[PDB]
Design a protein around this ligand. Structure first.
Ligand SMILES: *[C@@H]1O[C@H](CO)[C@@H](O[C@@H]2O[C@H](CO)[C@@H](O[C@@H]3O[C@H](CO[C@H]4O[C@H](CO[C@H]5O[C@H](CO)[C@@H](O)[C@H](O)[C@@H]5O)[C@@H](O)[C@H](O[C@H]5O[C@H](CO)[C@@H](O)[C@H](O)[C@@H]5O[C@H]5O[C@H](CO)[C@@H](O)[C@H](O)[C@@H]5O)[C@@H]4O)[C@@H](O)[C@H](O)[C@@H]3O)[C@H](O)[C@H]2NC(C)=O)[C@H](O)[C@H]1NC(C)=O
Ligand SMILES: CCc1nc2c(C)cc(N3CCN(CC(=O)N4CC(O)C4)CC3)cn2c1N(C)c1nc(-c2ccc(F)cc2)c(C#N)s1
Ligand SMILES: *[C@@H]1O[C@H](CO)[C@@H](O)[C@H](O)[C@H]1NC(C)=O
Ligand SMILES: [Ca+2]
Ligand SMILES: [Cl-]
Ligand SMILES: [Cl-]
Ligand SMILES: [Cl-]
Ligand SMILES: [Mg+2]
Ligand SMILES: [Zn+2]
Ligand SMILES: [Zn+2]
Length: 768
């Protein structure tokens, strides 16, 4: 209960209740609506109202005293004192923060916009003149990549925390938690309960370190114009109460985008309306002389794609009993049993029945651990085991148009990409930066406010090139390598088997960042870090020049496997284990096919180059190694390739210890990888060959799932040239994803600054 006879006079939107959540499922004071939500005579002055008698019933004021009180209309001195709009002024550089004396730091305003597709910036100064001036005058990128699923709640909270949805808990707009036995929905009281929201959002991080925060939630009752005036009012408060971080949120252009689709003619007016709101903010900041003091982030949560009811796949066309499953539908699918203790429910049968039933099926089923690792969408009990990736432009529903637009698809889809602009004293002047992921902004926003960020999934230092003015450190090597010479006789081995750095290790040896034991093994054509714990290489580095020749293996040397005299028999694999395992075969990390001579080819058959590989996966690996590596080398002027295994049985995106591994080669202690990776590097200046590179690097990487069939690839019955490249692209990855998965640290000795290397490690080759 609260005594609502108490007033909100002189405390509207305070930091009885008068806060932004008091209309949600609480209760405001009796005069909240009268005092705080005044809408009389609009949000703009006229020549008629200039120097008028002050009326407290007005929404904003044009009287002579309004400036000292800090509640002028945003255009007051434009209309009444003959000043120009902020937009009409010439672009002047801010070489330092021009804040009133008393300010301890420049303020940050985060202007978030729902469903702002990246291609909307193409409209230009005709439709959005304020946003366009912010973009051209400040720091900007072509786009910003959201997280998966590309929905509002997961992305806005990712922006707040720097965390993947699996880690912060908001894995969807809709979700079920089986420990709570409760459902989160866009509509309802449940979403306000704190138990759903993990991590530490920017506003808590700020408050804990002595920095006051504005509201990061506005009620839908409060109009957009009031929100701006509230922020401007808070900026005029005294030094003890004045916040340093502020947020604005708009539900446009999302709401319109759903109705009319991203390229509808009706989209123009919503964009005009948003820019009108941005113009009020900049004009109001100019009135306060804070227009060269505040840092402003214009950011979206995701894009928008053409979707209609005609393009709906129905699960009832694939499964028999759709009345026994619950489906979270639309631009993604999540399937679970409707009733617990249902013996008729079979997950394998559901996945089999959804797998490659038509030539042109517009979704694909996955167990969540088999999803592309770049999505980081497994490690949460709120994410269901069965997942459907839906093809762009389509929906999935259970069984059988108001809307023309939707989103939520795979976060590398062009139409899901969104927007970023940074403008102010701490952002650079007229600078263009490469695309980046929204997980990185938490760290930047902490830097901008002088805060120590909480542990997050950004790579602190990767966005230093956005700011005019944090120094990142390279991690400490935990285990030093051994460099074994010849230590064992050929006759010491009973494995049942029968029969450099300047060229092949260009960017230093990788640093092992966990406690283990491993050997560096040199060869003519390749180098490797051989693990005596996991009985295979952690990594294998080799360089293929532009004009390198692919030979083949002679018929008699097909099953050649040789003991390596530098490694003990008891820390080596054996062929007998592979003969006994009916389901498992083996492959090589450096391919025999790319040997520089017949003599060197014998090094590639060493037991220390061998790795366990299902026959179905060898179809993928042989095509990658024999055909594609030469093709990449030809096209990129040679390539350096680093390949190795990944073990992630608990699908948490992090390198497994020994106890997490659930699958070994039959009757052995040879662990089976869940995935295989490659990091393919060359010169960005493609006129220089990869081994003699002067400038910036170019990188692409993948994390291929190590699966005993090719059920993911619908054309796998065809030749590898019809389906393998398509599989690899789907599983593209940042080098940083591989570092988490292996506890390795790559690119430790280059000619580039460490900040530029962290940008390189966060790059995703999207193929879009
Ligand atoms: C992306 O970055 C993430 C952050 O660096 C990485 O996640 C982190 O991973 C490490 C290693 O696995 C975990 O470390 C273990 O922590 C155990 C204790 O965890 C519990 O306490 C934490 C308390 O934190 C305090 O400070 C934070 C701010 O820093 C405040 O927000 C807290 O309130 C508190 O004051 C807490 O962070 C953690 O939170 C999880 O659990 C709650 C509910 O129980 C969820 O609401 C929340 O979303 C977190 O869930 C996530 O992590 C758990 C595992 O902890 C998963 O099961 C779940 O599915 C979800 O992914 C928790 O309450 C400790 O016993 C161990 O010895 C380790 O030190 C961190 O817990 C974990 N933190 C977070 C926030 O995820 C992530 O690996 C990384 N990913 C990649 C691919 O690189
Ligand atoms: C889709 C719009 C929206 N609607 C709501 C509602 C109704 C509630 C809501 N809550 C209510 C519950 N609240 C609990 C809370 O205070 N904390 C959980 C942490 O421990 C701190 C978390 C957020 C966020 N909402 C949001 N979100 C996610 C918003 N995000 C932002 C946002 C976040 C980060 C930004 F950088 C910019 C804007 C807003 C603003 N301004 S509003
Ligand atoms: C799979 O499809 C077959 C053939 O249409 C059907 O008889 C069977 O019941 C389906 N299984 C499930 C679990 O839906
Ligand atoms: Ca793991
Ligand atoms: Cl300052
Ligand atoms: Cl080369
Ligand atoms: Cl570089
Ligand atoms: Mg076998
Ligand atoms: Zn949204
Ligand atoms: Zn939407």
């Amino acid at each position: 209960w609260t005594n609502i006879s108490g007033s909100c006079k002189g405390r509207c939107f305070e930091l009885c209740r008068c806060d932004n959540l008091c209309k949600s499922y609480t209760s405001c004071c009796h005069d909240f609506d009268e005092l705080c939500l005044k809408t009389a005579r609009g949000w703009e002055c006229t020549k008629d109202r200039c120097g008028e008698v002050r009326n407290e019933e007005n929404a904003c004021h044009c009287s002579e005293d309004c400036l000292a009180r800090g509640d002028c209309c945003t255009n007051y001195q434009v209309v009444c004192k003959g000043e120009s709009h902020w937009v009409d002024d010439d672009c002047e550089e801010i070489k330092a923060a021009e804040c009133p004396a008393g300010f301890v730091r420049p303020p940050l305003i985060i202007f978030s916009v729902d469903g702002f597709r990246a291609s909307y910036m193409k409209k230009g100064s005709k439709v959005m003149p304020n946003i366009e001036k912010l973009r051209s005058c400040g720091t900007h990128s072509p786009y910003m990549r959201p997280v998966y699923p590309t929905k509002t709640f997961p992305n806005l909270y990712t922006l707040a925390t720097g965390l993947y949805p699996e880690s912060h808990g908001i894995v969807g707009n809709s979700m079920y938690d089986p420990v709570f036995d409760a459902t989160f929905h866009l509509r309802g009281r449940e979403k306000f309960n704190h138990r759903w929201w993990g991590g530490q959002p920017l506003w808590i991080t700020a408050t804990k370190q002595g920095v006051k925060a504005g509201t990061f939630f506005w009620s839908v009752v409060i109009p957009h114009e009031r929100r701006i005036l509230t922020i401007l009012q808070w900026l005029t408060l005294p030094d003890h109460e004045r916040p340093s971080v502020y947020a604005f949120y708009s539900e446009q252009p999302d709401f319109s985008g759903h109705k009319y689709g991203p390229f509808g003619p009706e989209m123009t007016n919503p964009l005009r309306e948003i820019d009108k709101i941005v113009g009020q903010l900049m004009d109001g900041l100019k009135q306060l002389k804070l227009h060269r003091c505040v840092n402003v982030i214009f950011v979206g949560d995701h894009g928008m794609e053409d979707v209609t009811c005609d393009r709906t796949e129905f699960l009832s066309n694939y499964l028999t009993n759709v009345d026994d499953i619950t489906l979270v539908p639309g631009t993604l699918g999540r399937i679970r049993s409707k009733f617990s203790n249902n013996a008729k429910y079979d997950p394998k049968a559901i996945i089999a029945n959804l797998t490659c039933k038509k030539p042109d099926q517009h979704f694909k089923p996955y167990l969540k651990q088999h999803l592309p690792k770049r999505l980081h969408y497994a490690n949460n009990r709120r994410i269901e085991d069965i997942h459907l990736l839906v093809e762009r432009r389509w929906h999935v529903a259970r069984k059988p148009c108001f809307f023309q637009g939707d989103h939520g698809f795979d976060n590398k889809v062009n139409s899901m990409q969104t927007v970023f602009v940074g403008y102010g004293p701490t952002f650079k002047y007229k600078t263009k930066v490469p695309p980046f992921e929204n997980i990185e902004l938490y760290n930047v926003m902490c830097d901008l406010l002088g805060l120590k960020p909480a542990p997050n999934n950004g790579t602190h230092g990767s966005l230093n090139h956005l700011l005019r003015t944090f120094r990142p450190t390279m991690p400490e090597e935990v285990t030093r390598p051994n460099y074994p010479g010849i230590m064992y006789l050929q006759s010491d081995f009973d494995l049942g088997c029968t029969c450099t750095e300047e060229r092949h290790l260009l960017y230093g040896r990788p640093a092992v960042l966990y406690r283990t034991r491993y050997d560096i093994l040199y060869h003519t054509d390749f180098e490797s870090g051989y693990s005596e714990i996991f009985l295979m290489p952690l990594w294998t580095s080799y360089t293929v020049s532009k004009q390198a020749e692919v030979s083949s293996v002679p018929d008699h040397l097909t099953s050649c496997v040789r003991p390596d005299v530098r490694v003990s028999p008891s820390f080596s694999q054996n062929c007998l284990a592979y003969k006994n395992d009916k389901q498992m075969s083996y492959g090589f990390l450096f391919p025999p096919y790319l040997s520089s001579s017949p003599e060197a080819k014998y090094d590639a058959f060493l037991v220390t180059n061998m790795v366990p590989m299902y026959p179905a996966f060898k179809r993928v690996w042989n095509y990658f190694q024999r055909v594609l590596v030469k093709k990449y080398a030809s096209e990129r002027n040679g390539v350096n390739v680093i390949s190795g295994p990944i073990f992630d049985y608990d699908y948490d995106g992090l390198h497994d210890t020994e106890d997490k591994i659930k699958q070994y080669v039959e009757g052995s202690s040879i662990p089976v990888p869940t995935h295989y990776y490659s990091i393919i590097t060359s010169c960005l200046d493609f006129t220089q060959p990869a081994d003699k590179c002067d400038g910036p690097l170019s990188v692409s990487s993948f994390i291929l799932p190590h699966r005993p069939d090719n059920e993911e690839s619908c054309n796998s019955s065809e030749d590898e040239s019809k389906w393998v490249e398509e599989l690899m692209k789907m599983h593209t990855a940042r080098v940083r994803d591989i570092e988490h998965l292996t506890s390795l640290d790559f690119f430790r000795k280059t000619s580039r600054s460490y900040p530029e290397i962290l940008t390189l490690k966060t790059y995703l080759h999207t193929y879009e």
